[PDB]
Amino acid sequence: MLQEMGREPTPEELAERMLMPEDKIRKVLKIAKEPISMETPIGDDEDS
DNA sequence: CCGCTGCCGCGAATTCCGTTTCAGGGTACGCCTGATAATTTGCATTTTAAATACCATTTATTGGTTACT
């Protein structure tokens, strides 16, 4: 759908294409993400 | 036949500060079924317009008349 429209799809249009209610799509989008490692260097210098 | 090379380990200052909390894998689909997580009623304890059943010590009405502008 992104290559067809040439941009990113809004959740409403995506919901239209999957034939599912908007809230279901939103719930899946928020569930999807995976946890972040506690050792990721947040400081530019790899100290902190 | 006890010498030298070559591997692999190990280590390299101190506080603060700053900052974008941030992204990237490229693989299917439709059944039965039990398995929870939702939703529906009744029964224990309060709290009940109040209603109720006794003790209580402290003014109220009081018992008014005998003196007298």
Chain CA centroid to CA A10, Å: 11
Interatomic separation, CA of residue A17 and C1' of nucleotide B29, rounded (Å): 19
Resolution of the structure in the document, Å: 3.2
| Cα A15 to Cα A2: distance, rounded to the nearest angstrom | 14
CA angle centred on A12, ends A10 and A17, rounded to 5°: 100
| Cα A47 to Cα A44: distance, rounded to the nearest angstrom | 8
Interatomic separation, CA of residue A20 and C1' of nucleotide B47, rounded (Å): 52
Residue A37's nearest nucleotide, by CA–C1', is B21
